[PDB]
Amino acid sequence: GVQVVITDPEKLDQIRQRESDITKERIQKILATGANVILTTGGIDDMCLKYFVEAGAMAVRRVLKRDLKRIAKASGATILSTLANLEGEETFEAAMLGQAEEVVQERICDDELILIKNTKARTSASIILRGANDFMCDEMERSLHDALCVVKRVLESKSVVPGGGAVEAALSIYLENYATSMGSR
Amino acid sequence: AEKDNAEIRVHTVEDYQAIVDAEWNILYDKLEKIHHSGAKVVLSKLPIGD
Amino acid sequence: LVLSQNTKRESGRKVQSGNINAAKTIADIIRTCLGPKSMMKMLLDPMGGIVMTNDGNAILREIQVQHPAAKSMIEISRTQDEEVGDGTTSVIILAGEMLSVAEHFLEQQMHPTVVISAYRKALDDMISTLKKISIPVDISDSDMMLNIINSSITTKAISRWSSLACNIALDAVKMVQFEENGRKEIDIKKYARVEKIPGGIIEDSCVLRGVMINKDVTHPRMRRYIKNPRIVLLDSSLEYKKGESQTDIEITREEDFTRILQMEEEYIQQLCEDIIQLKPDVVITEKGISDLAQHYLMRANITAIRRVRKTDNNRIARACGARIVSRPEELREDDVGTGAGLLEIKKIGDEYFTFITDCKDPKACTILLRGASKEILSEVERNLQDAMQVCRNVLLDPQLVPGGGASEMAVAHALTEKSKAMTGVEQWPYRAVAQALEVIPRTLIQNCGASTIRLLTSLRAKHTQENCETWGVNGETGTLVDMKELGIWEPLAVKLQTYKTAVETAVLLLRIDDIVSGHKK
Amino acid sequence: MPTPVILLKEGTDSSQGIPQLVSNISACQVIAEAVRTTLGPRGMDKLIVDGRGKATISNDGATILKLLDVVHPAAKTLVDIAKSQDAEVGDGTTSVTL
Amino acid sequence: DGRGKATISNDGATILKLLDVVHPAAKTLVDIAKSQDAEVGDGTTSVTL
Amino acid sequence: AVKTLNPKAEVARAQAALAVNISAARGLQDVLRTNLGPKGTMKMLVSGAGDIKLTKDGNVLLHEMQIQHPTASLIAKVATAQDDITGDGTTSNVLIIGELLKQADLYISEGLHPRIITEGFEAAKEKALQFLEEVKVSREMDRETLIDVARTSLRTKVHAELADVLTEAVVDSILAIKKQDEPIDLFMIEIMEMKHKSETDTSLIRGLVLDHGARHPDMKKRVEDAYILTCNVSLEYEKTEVNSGFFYKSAEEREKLVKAERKFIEDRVKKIIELKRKVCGDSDKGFVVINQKGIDPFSLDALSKEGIVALRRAKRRNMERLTLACGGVALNSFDDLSPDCLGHAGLVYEYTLGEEKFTFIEKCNNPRSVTLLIKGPNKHTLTQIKDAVRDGLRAVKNAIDDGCVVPGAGAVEVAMAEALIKHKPSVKGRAQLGVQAFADALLIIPKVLAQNSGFDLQETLVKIQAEHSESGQLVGVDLNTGEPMVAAEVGVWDNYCVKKQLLHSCTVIATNILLVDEIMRAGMS
Amino acid sequence: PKAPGFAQMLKEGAKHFSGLEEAVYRNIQACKELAQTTRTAYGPNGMNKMVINHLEKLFVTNDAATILRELEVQHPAAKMIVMASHMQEQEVGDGTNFVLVFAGALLELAEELLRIGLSVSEVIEGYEIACRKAHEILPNLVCCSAKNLRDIDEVSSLLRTSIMSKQYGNEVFLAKLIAQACVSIFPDSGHFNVDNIRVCKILGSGISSSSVLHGMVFKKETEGDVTSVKDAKIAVYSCPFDGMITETKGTVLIKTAEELMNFSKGEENLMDAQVKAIADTGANVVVTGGKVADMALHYANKYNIMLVRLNSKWDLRRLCKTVGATALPRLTPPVLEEMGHCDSVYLSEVGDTQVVVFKHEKEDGAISTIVLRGSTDNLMDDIERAVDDGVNTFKVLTRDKRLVPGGGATEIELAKQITSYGETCPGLEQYAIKKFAEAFEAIPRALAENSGVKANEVISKLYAVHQEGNKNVGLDIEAEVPAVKDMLEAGILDTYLGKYWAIKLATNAAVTVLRVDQIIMAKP
Amino acid sequence: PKAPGFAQMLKEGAKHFSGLEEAVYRNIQACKELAQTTRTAYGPNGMNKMVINHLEKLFVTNDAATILRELEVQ
């Protein structure tokens, strides 16, 4: 709610000055670490963009939270909701950084998507689909999601069942025989 | 009631007391002027304080 | 009531036949549009304008449908166009005829899935065969590139302007290569802006080694002509701005009001001398410009242009090599607009324009299209889009294929041999695909207007001869012509994506067997 | 403005195959349930009133089916069997339908 | 009036004011009624007659 | 066919939609053909709003007569482009299109596939363009030449007398415009109209006219010798962009803050006053101020007390025009102000008409910007004569731009006819048919001229179709006797740019239109 | 049946007109409709008219321009001639009547030639040449070049023509009052501006009692007393008469107790000081259009100051001109030099209407006002319209000079001269010029029809007596003698400029309307 | 928009078919419709059929002629 009230006009200019210099120094603290790639679900302003260009780093905005969490898990970077420390001063540490061999935006279907290859901390896997229409592509991604589900089940439970309906093939007769045991209705 | 519209700022509580006292002193001053005038009948276009 | 209350359903062979009918109709409404002999199609848009173009993609994009599979085909066409530019002159036709022969095996009670597997094998063999019958070609050699472009465009209205079109496309594409990827630089087709200005003639249109800005000088004094300008890109507004943090002021002494009024003036000045410290010549911004800053820049003899679209800003920056800047105090001489061979502001007639030409090594460029009227110009620019797209595809792959249906016939007899060596139930679908391929040259023939049956037979019989695979169909003569001397060549990736999407269309449609309406969500 | 030419009349209903057949079976079962209770030494009779308001009770199933004016085609065959057995041998028309 | 408020009058000008005249020529007469009412008084009646 | 895809959609087919297009073009050309030719009859249009036009320039008709046939809208767009380039021949363009398509139908109806006639048109356009280039008459910027060109353009639009009056004005303007390399037709050409006293009395004014007047009584109406101050910075009050509502405690401080608030504008006006008094120490000279923004009433009082004329809120090109008129230095910051930045006029006064007010700037030493003050008895006639003025201006601009000029009255067209018909089937043969048709269609201009002028078409065309001898001249059609005429001698011309542009545009339009087969309509509900 | 063909579907529903059929018949018919509409209009024997607008407001009228303004018309060339006459009125005054009659006659006679097959363009040529010849011959008809600047008698006699034209009953009174108005106004802001005269409407006390004041008037209340001083000192203030409120949101603030007392007291004291300073310069009367503070008027009453209220910008401008004192946006400086000076100012009652009067005597020149008295406000509208038309007439007179003999006599001479030039024309246009000359008989014709005497032999006798050069003799107004009258002695004159301009505008309207052949009309 | 042209208004509301499009597609499609209609008809393994007329009368049938008689075709 912090209203800014002026009784000495001599300072409005400096006020406005730091209103951006705060972000400027935050950015400079980030970059002095030597980080060349930054991601942010939150907004990214042109002020930061031009600074990054002058630094030549990598910047991405409005990324979904799950994706960046996966990024941290893969590259070994640390999700950072803000800059802070056990002491009040806002600092940033290279130890927070994650790694991956090469990061490229590439044009697939005249739309540029961003790739991250071979994070050293933890190997990650992503799959790109190519197809004719959006209908076939999203139905096949549903299919692939089912694929990953069943393979996960297989790995989690080291146990398999013969497919093609052998299940009830056996079950019908086995239960048929077991039925007479009960003797009831 | 409908005189000039003004915000007021007062640090000392005693000054806030003085402020309310001074408002009522405004009205009392007006009334004293009226009485010491020596008249007994007063008419007003505008509303009269109780 | 059980299911959904006013949701229809339909099942089985009826559904399959209906989808096949829809696909066949979709193909049919375009079968006339292909070939150098092609027709010219024009559209009535919903909201008043007129659109005329041969390019199938736009034709279909201006179609709404009710049957779903038609919509699927529409999307397929738009995808192929996006990826490759043309071939959509043929892709949907091929898909439709593919399906039409495909249905003939449905009443064979042949279940779809096995036919699908046959199609997949067919695609594999077709890809292999086409790769076997490619020709690698140099990319630097200009006139072969021009020949390729002429080949890929001599189907639409720009044919008679082939020389200009090919020179335009070659110039534009060649000079767009962001070498910052090491030896893996990528060209992009969103910096190759296209500007449609009426009047003049096609012959007047030319490649401008720079950018076009549909704006004007803000004040009379700035010179409209400069040899070696220096350019500064101000992304930020150049004027006094809202204190973003809902600031307020409570003045008490008289001088204070006039003083704060002077303060914004002073801030404007500060920005001004910060700019002029770099000895620029040109000021560009996407935002507004204060007339007071305009005054100061005028006093410095500096040209200023205001409120230009962000993409236009990016293109200008790529033109004069400078980089955009949002902080005047942080301006660097590294972003000085060096590399502008000439700054000028002409009159096209009732409108000023901005010319920035003769860059040292311009990487961005916009094409100046000057023709008869906006709709013909739009047709021209669509054709240019297709041409420059296939040119970039070549610069990604130096492999070429003989078109004119020749490759199609090669694939045809190749699959025929594979089939007669490939006994089984799937054999019939395989050769069915082979025969379905034959219709591209067929359509060429009808659009020419010659004896389709005898010509096609002569073609196929000719192409049983192993010694020649370059025999194709001339557009105008309607006679068998070996493609080499005729020279109608196409990039390999084009025809690759063509068949590839085609068989994808086939599988996607053939798996469909039922319809459900009214989701209401 | 041409239009596609239809095959049969507008609204000509058609339904082919296994769904059609199973629908017919279900309809026959529905007809059965209208008569299922009827036969038996402890069996049953129904009351059906026409649109004219004249009441009519019956235990013989064939009479009931005559009163239940069936619209669905397949069940008309069953009701016709009811008439046949009624003209031939008598009760068990109920049983015939079951 | 249409609002239900009664109004009796003997001065003719008041009455003519109440009788909202639509016909044009008579509007002149009613205006004369206003004129005489503002000028000299009764006989506005007589004026109209 | 697409009906199965979509029921509510609509299509034609090849023969059908081709007939649709040719019929629509033929109807459009029938509507328009009454216009071209000085003997032509201009048209009055009435908008649904009750407004009124009385034009002849076809572009107005097409843009303002609402039509639904698609090709009609297409042709309207191409004509609009044409008008944005040159000004007349829009009529000629649409007539060419319609009649060329007519001949095209005559031939295709004989079973000729259109593409053949397309190619014939291409070759014919090439040869015609070559001939047009070689035939253009290179003429210098003689005043009488421009006069004749303007008269030829103008007599298309108005009274002969009105065009005669206006021609001198337009040519004097254009002569007084050029900086020998580049006219721009915008700044130096001020087009204003006053509902006043005549249509004839419209005349060039050597200076600039402004569309507003003084806002105070003490404002002097007339100024003998004027010094001009061109500016746009506000002399009205304004409050800073940042919220600055302030407080005070004594009622005297209320007045003090009022004075302070005014003080900044007080400084602004005082700088101007001091400049005046420094420069206009003499009594006679007059000081006038033009502001693109407003002027405060208190500022009005201040300037009046010094007897200074000031005007507020002029259109943003007016300062350009003042710069090119009185050479004043358009400035913003009054802080950096000098006598050298002033502008000088020989005379400035105010003219009051109706309720509006007007301002005159007079007797610039070397004016480079002027005003075609349009006097009009009637509002519609103002618009009509204004369109005529713009037509003439653009025509003269093309004339000066291209060092050549084409003889008028369609002599170019009979020349194209005789040249094109003088092409043996050096073409591939079947294209000779299309070439024949194109040459035939070219002859429309003389045809419509004669028809509008009443003479019998065929016999006049045959008569003029007499290239005389080795000196087979470019022969125009007389517009009052229907007899062969040497256009160059009688001085009836037109811009090469016009003919070249119309030929190219019509060729492209026609070759595109003849290549459509069906006109479909499938859009969202 | 039921299905003819269209070869052009270009229109989405609209009117296409073509084939000269509209020019030959329909457009001409519309013009004749207007001609019949206001044929009764012009004439001393012309009788008045009333019309109600689309918003049901009465308009008693004799002027043609006003009545045309109240008929919302749709045929286009009807609008052509309408707005032509409208601008003519904007230029000269009366003549709207004249020009519409001219247009009707010229159109009607032109269509006859068009029917007899004359070329439309040739009709144009003939009409133009005839109009130009008439312009050439007109100055040769001027008589009685009345030159007296500021006499009352000459100008009264002159303005009698227009007043008599648009009001036949009350020539003497209106003549004398408007003449008093004209002489009272000198060249002060430049050559007797029409705007320098103001008109007020006050019902009751019939027309004969209407009067003129050498000052200017207000129908507004008063706030203090009602006094006049033979040396009345007037102060003018565009700013509202109150303490100058900052435009910025200025909220007065306090910090300690005594601020309230001192702030209210100081407000009182400084309003008192301001108004006192105003009184110190002796100004006894103050005017403003802005809001009046109650404190201010209270102090004014204490100091015996007069107040005037709610004036609009134009009103205070008028008052500024009347007293010649400059309005002051700053409330403070009642400067001596720019301070008011009036003979007398007071409040009076007329027609149960509070009236503020600035009764004046000004040698240097003042913008006076006329007071209109009588019963019917509609008659006020008519009579004030006529008076303003007369004022315009006097202004045009002052523009240059040269009264011309009215009563049609001038126009009969025009007809004779134009015809005579006609037989020396020869060429197919001879019929055009002859018909144009014939057209001028419309005016005397109209005077006859509104006079109700047999027009034809009146015109014949007029011709005959005009065969002897009696250019001053014209149509009488008398049933006993439906023959003739000599205009010059009767003083029935009118202005050169008015006739010249009416003729030229009528010519322009005609040449425009005849010219267009086919019409296009989008749906309204 | 909303207004293409007709070069022939000869019809008061009717269907004009032309261009071989009907012969190539629509007529053939109708014939195939009939073919599918009674493809199941013939055959010892052909199974019977029922149809109700426009007047709601049952017709169990295997014969093709009878069933065609009961479909009122256009």
Side-chain angles (χ1 to χ4, degrees), chain C residues 17 20 42 54 83 100-101 216 237 239 314 329 336 359 392 483 487:
Chain C
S17 164
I20 285 308
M42 81 170 173
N54 189 179
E83 179 58 31
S100 183
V101 65
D216 191 11
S237 74
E239 46 275 25
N314 297 306
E329 90 282 16
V336 166
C359 176
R392 90 171 295 170
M483 183 46 107

Side-chain angles (χ1 to χ4, degrees), chain F residues 170 172-180 182-185 188-189 367-370 393:
Chain F
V170 64
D172 291 331
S173 66
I174 288 299
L175 271 193
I177 291 164
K178 66 179 72 66
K179 314 173 296 195
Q180 66 78 34
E182 289 300 329
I184 62 170
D185 185 82
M188 72 291 291
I189 293 313
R368 318 302 322 285
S369 66
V370 287
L393 266 297

Side-chain angles (χ1 to χ4, degrees), chain F residues 24 99 115 155 198 215 280 285 308 338 384 387 392 413 425 466 516:
Chain F
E99 296 269 35
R115 221 164 174 100
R155 284 178 175 269
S198 162
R215 296 303 167 180
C280 183
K285 291 172 172 179
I308 310 305
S338 78
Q384 185 268 333
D387 203 68
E413 282 321 296
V516 66

Side-chain angles (χ1 to χ4, degrees), chain B residues 10-19:
Chain B
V10 158
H11 294 88
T12 295
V13 171
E14 307 143 0
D15 291 331
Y16 166 76
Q17 268 287 108
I19 288 296

